[PDB]
């Protein structure tokens, strides 16, 4: 089925520009939307006119026109009709609810069979994070739960308040949320949006370049989310490619994809809940992959109550990329989320006991009570998810004792 | 098997698989073009677990 991309905020718009440039390069679509000389299926991400032009399905949302202007000028094939221009931002989103609801309904009507909503946004984006938090609520309300949502939220490197307020709605409404940290991205680079764009583009490779299996997003996601509570994913990318000293075999890709240094978020000891590895090359040797799967299963520490299966998808490289060597992406579901969530909660508590900057949000007695109850609910939800991820680790998870 | 109309599956399969755009006279058809229209999907009385037992609702 078709997918709709939502871009919110300055960071979201920049990441989306890199993402769409990568996708258009992979499908050979020119900057003006004209084709270049089919077995691939860009229709899932591009709308095809009866004049042979490809335009992205994405929707651009931002508080200021400079970022949107740069993005549109860089890629002229964006449709201008889809362009629209913390608590203050969220209340502003309430005012524009009708316009945005109709704007999204236009894209849904334009496609034939909708599958999922992609969202590119930054949790630490301030006002834009507020408008994206409202976007999740309105979409989930109007379209129910038949269509799932995927959020490629960028985590932060007064900010604690914003991170908690955005994470409350991220937990409530998102169906499968990727976690990216600028710290680990710049550590890997030792710009940064080119890693996120690459990971997001590769995550959907089996859909755009069909093969024997994994033809739908339901199959890709369902392998990684045993419970709707544990919805945060850790993504790992192998950087050593296109150099002379590349990984010599896909088997070494499978073994060295699990290194903790390549993960896109700060990690000690972790337990894996689910696994799925992407291998993308013109030709793939099966016996190497079998040996690598066996070693990966014998090496990785799974939680007791999970089936303990490692899945390797055999992605196909784009014809428009000339004979490049193998590359691969790893997406995992770990219990390492407790560390980052604990860090966020510690910062939030430290800055909530001290009334440092709450004057910018508490306007009156009723506003004080409103913000206090909202903050308490967000804190309780985050603690609930931490406790759930902690109870997953132990062996008595399925016991009623 | 019997609680559904058989003739509907044929059509709902042809809309997916054997869709076509025609080409002008003299333009060579592709072999895929020729073999697309040949295929037919039909419901049969021999179930998989019964038909495979011979060559051992």
């Amino acid at each position: 089925g078709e997918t709709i991309t939502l871009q919110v905020g300055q960071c979201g718009n920049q990441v989306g520009l890199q993402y769409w440039q990568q996708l258009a390069t992979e499908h050979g679509i020119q900057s003006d939307g004209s084709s270049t000389p089919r077995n691939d299926h860009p229709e899932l991400f591009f709308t095809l006119s009866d004049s042979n032009t490809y335009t992205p399905r994405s929707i651009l949302i931002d508080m200021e026109p400079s970022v949107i202007a740069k993005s549109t000028s860089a890629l002229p094939m964006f449709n201008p009709r889809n362009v629209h221009l913390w608590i203050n931002g969220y209340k502003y989103g309430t005012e524009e609810e009708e316009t945005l609801l109709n704007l999204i309904d236009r894209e849904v009507d334009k496609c034939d069979n909708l599958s999922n909503f992609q969202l590119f946004h930054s949790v630490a984006g301030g006002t834009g994070s507020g408008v994206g938090s409202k976007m999740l609520e309105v979409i989930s309300d109007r379209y129910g739960h038949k269509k799932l949502l995927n959020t490629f939220s960028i985590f932060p490197s007064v900010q604690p308040y914003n991170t908690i307020l955005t994470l409350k709605r991220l937990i409530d409404y998102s169906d499968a949320t990727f976690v990216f940290h600028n710290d680990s991205l710049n550590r890997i680079e030792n710009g940064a949006n080119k890693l996120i764009a690459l990971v997001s583009a590769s995550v959907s490779n089996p859909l755009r370049f069909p093969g024997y299996m994994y033809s739908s997003m339901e199959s890709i996601v369902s392998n990684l989310i045993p419970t709707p509570d544990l919805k945060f994913l850790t993504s790992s990318i192998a950087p050593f490619s296109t150099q002379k000293h590349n990984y010599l075999n896909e088997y070494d890709m499978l073994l060295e994809l699990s290194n903790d240094r390549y993960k896109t978020n700060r990690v000690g000891d972790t337990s894996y809940i689910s696994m799925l590895n992407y291998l993308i090359g013109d030709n793939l040797d099966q016996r190497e992959i079998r040996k690598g799967i066996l070693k990966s299963q014998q090496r990785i520490s799974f939680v007791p109550w999970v089936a303990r299966s490692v899945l390797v998808v055999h992605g196909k490289k784009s014809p428009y990329l000339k004979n490049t060597n193998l590359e691969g992406i790893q997406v995992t579901n770990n219990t390492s989320m407790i560390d980052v969530f604990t860090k966020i909660l510690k910062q939030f508590d430290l800055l909530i006991k001290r009334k440092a900057y709450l004057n910018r949000y508490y306007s009156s007695v009723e506003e004080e009570n409103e913000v206090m109850e909202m903050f308490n609910e967000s804190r309780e939800s985050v603690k609930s998810i931490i406790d759930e991820y902690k109870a997953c680790k132990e062996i008595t998870y399925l016991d009623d004792d | 098997k019997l609680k559904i109309s058989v003739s509907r599956l044929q059509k709902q399969y042809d809309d997916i698989f054997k869709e076509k755009i025609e080409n002008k006279v003299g333009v060579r058809p592709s072999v895929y073009d020729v073999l697309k229209k040949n295929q037919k999907l039909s419901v049969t009385s021999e179930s998989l677990y019964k038909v495979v037992e011979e060559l051992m609702d």
């Binding site: - | 002008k24 058809p29 072999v31």
Partner: protein, 157 residues
């Protein structure tokens, strides 16, 4: 089709005459009995509107799903587009076949070369498809045509 369009136009004349009568008589009548006559006239005109909608939908279906589809599928697509066949599949140029015959003077004509019997059969099938369509076939143990004609008799009455 002539019967259908005859009824479609008769409804237009009915609309015009009743609309003119509304301005000429009913609206100038005494206020005592104007209301009942206005109500009856509105009822009549609404019934006419329902019949017009039904006839227009029937004509639209026939015209743009039976006649037009059959024409584009059986005449245009038979004459001008390639009648791809299993013998046209074979590319004989794996044989050397340097020679060409009879001569370059013989045109290539942008249309499939049809025999006399082929032309007769082509036009016969094109007509037969329309006349023997799903709705127009003779197959409650009654055919669709009989029901349609019964509704047409209702409109005549």
């Amino acid at each position: 089709l002539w019967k259908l369009r005859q009824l479609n136009n008769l409804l237009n004349w009915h609309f015009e005459m009743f609309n003119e009568l509304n301005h000429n008589v009913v609206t100038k009548l005494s206020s005592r009995n104007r209301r009942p006559l206005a109500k009856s006239l509105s009822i009549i005109t609404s019934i006419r509107f329902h019949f017009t909608q039904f006839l227009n939908e029937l004509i639209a279906y026939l015209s743009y799903d039976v006649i037009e589809e059959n024409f584009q599928q059986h005449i245009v697509r038979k004459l001008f587009y390639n009648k791809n066949d299993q013998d046209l599949l074979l590319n004989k140029s794996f044989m050397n076949l340097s020679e060409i015959d009879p001569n370059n003077d013989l045109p290539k004509f942008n249309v499939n070369l049809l025999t006399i019997d082929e032309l007769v059969e082509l036009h016969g099938t094109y007509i037969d498809s329309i006349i023997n369509s799903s709705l127009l076939n003779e197959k409650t143990n009654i055919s669709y045509i009989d029901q349609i004609f019964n509704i047409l008799q209702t409109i005549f009455n």
